[PDB]
Amino acid sequence: MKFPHDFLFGAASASYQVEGAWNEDGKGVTNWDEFSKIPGKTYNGTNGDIAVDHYHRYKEDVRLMAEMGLESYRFSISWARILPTGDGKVNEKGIEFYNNLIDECLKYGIVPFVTLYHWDLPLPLEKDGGWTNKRTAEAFVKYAETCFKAFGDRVKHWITFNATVMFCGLGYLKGAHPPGIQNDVPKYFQATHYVFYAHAKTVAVYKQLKQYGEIGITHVFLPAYSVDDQKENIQAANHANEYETYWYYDPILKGEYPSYVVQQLKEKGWTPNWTVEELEIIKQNAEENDFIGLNYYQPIRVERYDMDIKLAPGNPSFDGFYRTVKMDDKTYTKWGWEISPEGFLEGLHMLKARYGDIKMYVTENGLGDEDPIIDGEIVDVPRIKFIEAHLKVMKRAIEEGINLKGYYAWSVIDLLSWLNGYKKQYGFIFVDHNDNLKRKKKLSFHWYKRVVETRGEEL
Ligand SMILES: C[C@@]1(C(=O)O)OC[C@H]2O[C@@H](O)[C@H](O)[C@@H](O)[C@H]2O1
């Protein structure tokens, strides 16, 4: 019984990835609904139209989570289910559905942890300029307030945004996410600003509501290490960390943007169109966050741009100052992501040094795999070893006085990986695409049950 009763063992899903029912019960079209049908954007033309069909079998999937001894389920609300056009009339049929999902989790004592925005923007709001238009931030606040009024009697754990770095960075820098834009740095940075503004304003509204649950944001956590002891490389890491960690966590946690990056955007002419009022709202609401969410999969190993010659190479950074690299002496997934428990642990240390005793939830962590199948059984031993290694570093972080209060494995069920199809499995529950999307427990499902039952006595 080592992890305290204070700490939730969970597993996670995202609405676009898991629900399907893209056109049902009054749901508005989203950006991912349109974007996924552009050839070249999703793996093998893979879709969320049906996804894994969680919308129609939510009762079954929740029964399974309960059978797994799950303590908390983290899912996302589809904004286009509540408010189809982003604003305007509320779709009651969408409110019914999330009330039913919430109520079913609750039957079995499973705690909802709810993400409001997991990348699936109602389409008009894309056409307005998405997160580059303050309007979308004001719309988001209204939506959040709608969800709070409708669901907040029962839901006491809320996430505003998920992984802003990806949706903003992939949407405006690489064109791999909607709206599909490439190398527009100013829009990227502007998008992150309006998101952080929407967050802080939403947090202020939630607290004025007097609902007595908790709220915070979920970021990607992607700690950057220097590939060696070389000063140029150390500097490349510092810079990586500034842009990938500090830009995101400082505004939410500290109430100020990191002056290092601010100085460089000014020089480059890329500073966002931000107002004093917006920055005050951010500044005054940094102290209102109850927690920080971490989606952590890997660190990155960096060398400076001109230290090739100075161990395979890496992708260059957006401003071309550094690049990430792969290395002989480390372990990678089959899609090339590093598996680094020591990476994660020092990462956690770096975060307590800067942000102090902030309450941390690991809102995503897991292994993407093409699962071994034997006699119709999914024997996903690699996933078990992945989660095991990460759970052990958490156990140690806690022993070391880090304020970690939950762990949500990425993918409670097999679902759609945005850009990797169904082939990049991440779940505890298998889904049979060849047998009418039927659910089967994997090896990992039974293992995780035991971990929760024992609260992590695994040495
Ligand atoms: C990007 C991908 C993947 O499919 O590879 O990684 C894992 C996980 O990242 C999370 O940060 C996203 O919220 C979620 O949607 C997941 O999907």
Numbering used by the authors: 1 to 310, 321 to 469
Publication passage describing the model:
In summary, we have characterized a novel PvGal-ase encoded by ORF1119 in Bacillus strain HMA207. The overall structure of ORF1119 was similar to those of other GH1 enzymes, which have a typical (β/α)8 barrel fold. The catalytic nucleophile (E374) and the catalytic acid/base (E163) residues of ORF1119 were conserved with other GH1 enzymes.
The crystals belonged to space group P3221 and contained two protein molecules in the asymmetric unit. Part of the structure was disordered (residues 311–320 in chain A of the PvGal complex) and was not included in the final model (red dotted line in Fig. 6A). The remaining activity of the catalytic acid/base residue mutant was considered to be enough for producing released PvGal during the long time scale of protein crystallization (typically 1–4 weeks in this study). The catalytic residues of ORF1119, E374 (nucleophile) and E163A (acid-base mutant) are in close proximity to the anomeric C1 and O1 atoms of PvGal, respectively. The carboxyl group of pyruvate forms hydrogen bonds with S427, K434 and Y436. W420 forms a stacking interaction with the sugar ring. These results indicate that the four residues in this region (S427, N430, K434 and Y436) of ORF1119 seem to be involved in binding to the pyruvate moiety in ORF1119.
